[PDB]
């Protein structure tokens, strides 16, 4: 499974995989949104929930928005992002974002969209105390289901879709969790 592809929670809920990562010991995981991993411990790669992805290994949500899923099969840990046209992009490292940067977002609801970083230090309020801060603001649209997907530029991983406003029909604004903070938190590296 590659970055951008759908992940399904046991008993309902869909998100997108961000990036596949590995610990210094060679254990592999999938990064996604923390608001996603908070809903279930077991994840699947198909809607019918018969192909197991793995089980939740960590969650950092409200505050940040990142989470980790341990792969049940190391071979499913594809170090690429799916481009939705039958092609894949190999991700070679992680980097920082900057205002004016041109970016691409891969998600399971709306496919691949591009845009620009328009702001930093952004905050989103999901209600019920769910405030996420330190986010990258962009003009890339996204829809529910895209959450946890990959934000990248070229071969460089940048962030994970948290959420935003608008849709891909009218345009919107999306907020992303910088990936490097996540890699740091878990001592993981891009595959």
* One domain, residues 52 and 98: no
67 with 58: CB under 8 angstroms? Answer: yes
Annotate 115-168 with DSSP letters as a single string.
EEEEEEEEEEE-STT-EEEEEEEES----TT-TT-EEEETTEEEEEEEEEEEET
Q: In the annotation, is 162 catalytic?
A: no
Q: What is the DSSP letter of 76?
A: G
The data reach a resolution, in angstroms, of 1.6
* One domain, residues 164 and 83: yes
* One domain, residues 85 and 72: no
* One domain, residues 173 and 95: yes
Longest CA span, the chain: 45
**CATH value at residue 19:** 2.40.10.10
Measure the CA angle with vertex 45, ends 43 and 46; round to 5°: 115
Catalytic-role residue among 16, 60, 108, 147: 147
* One domain, residues 94 and 84: yes
* One domain, residues 23 and 9: yes
Catalytic-role residue among 65, 78, 108, 162: 65
**Cis amide bond preceding 22, omega within 30:** no
* One domain, residues 164 and 185: no
Q: Which helix (H) or strand (E) holds 90?
A: strand 88-90
* One domain, residues 3 and 74: yes
* One domain, residues 95 and 66: no
* One domain, residues 19 and 83: no
* One domain, residues 154 and 91: yes
Q: Helix, strand, or coil here: 75?
A: helix
Catalytic-role residue among 16, 35, 60, 71: 35
Q: Which residues fall within 8 angstroms of residue 141, CB to CB, at 6 or more apart?
A: 110, 113, 115, 164, 166, 167, 168, 170, 171, 172, 174
Number of domains in the chain: 2
Q: In the annotation, is 113 catalytic?
A: no
74 backbone dihedrals φ, ψ, rounded to 5°: -60, -25
Per the entry, the structure determination technique was X-ray
Q: Which domain holds residue 156?
A: 79-178
Q: In the annotation, is 25 catalytic?
A: no
Neighbours of 130 (CB within 10 A): 15
* One domain, residues 104 and 116: yes
Question: What is the dihedral sign for C-alpha 43, 107, 85, 90?
Answer: negative
């Amino acid at each position: 499974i590659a970055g951008g592809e759908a992940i399904y929670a046991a008993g309902g809920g869909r998100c997108s995989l961000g990036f596949n990562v590995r610990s210094s010991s060679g254990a592999t995981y999938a990064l996604t949104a923390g608001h996603c991993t908070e809903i279930a411990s077991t994840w699947y790669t198909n809607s019918g929930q018969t192909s197991l992805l793995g089980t939740r290994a960590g969650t950092s949500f409200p505050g940040n928005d990142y989470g980790l899923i341990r792969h049940s099969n190391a071979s499913a840990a594809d170090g690429r992002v799916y481009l939705y046209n039958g092609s894949y992009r190999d991700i070679t490292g992680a980097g920082n974002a900057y205002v004016g940067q041109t970016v691409q977002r891969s998600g399971s609801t709306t496919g691949l969209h591009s845009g620009r970083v328009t702001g930093l230090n952004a905050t989103v309020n999901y209600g019920g105390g769910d405030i996420v801060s330190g986010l990258i603001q962009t003009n890339v649209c996204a829809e529910p289901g895209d959450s946890g997907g990959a934000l990248f530029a070229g071969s460089t991983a940048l962030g994970l879709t948290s959420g935003g406003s608008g849709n891909c029909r009218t345009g919107g604004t999306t907020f992303f969790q910088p990936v490097t903070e996540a890699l740091s938190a878990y001592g993981v590296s891009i595959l």
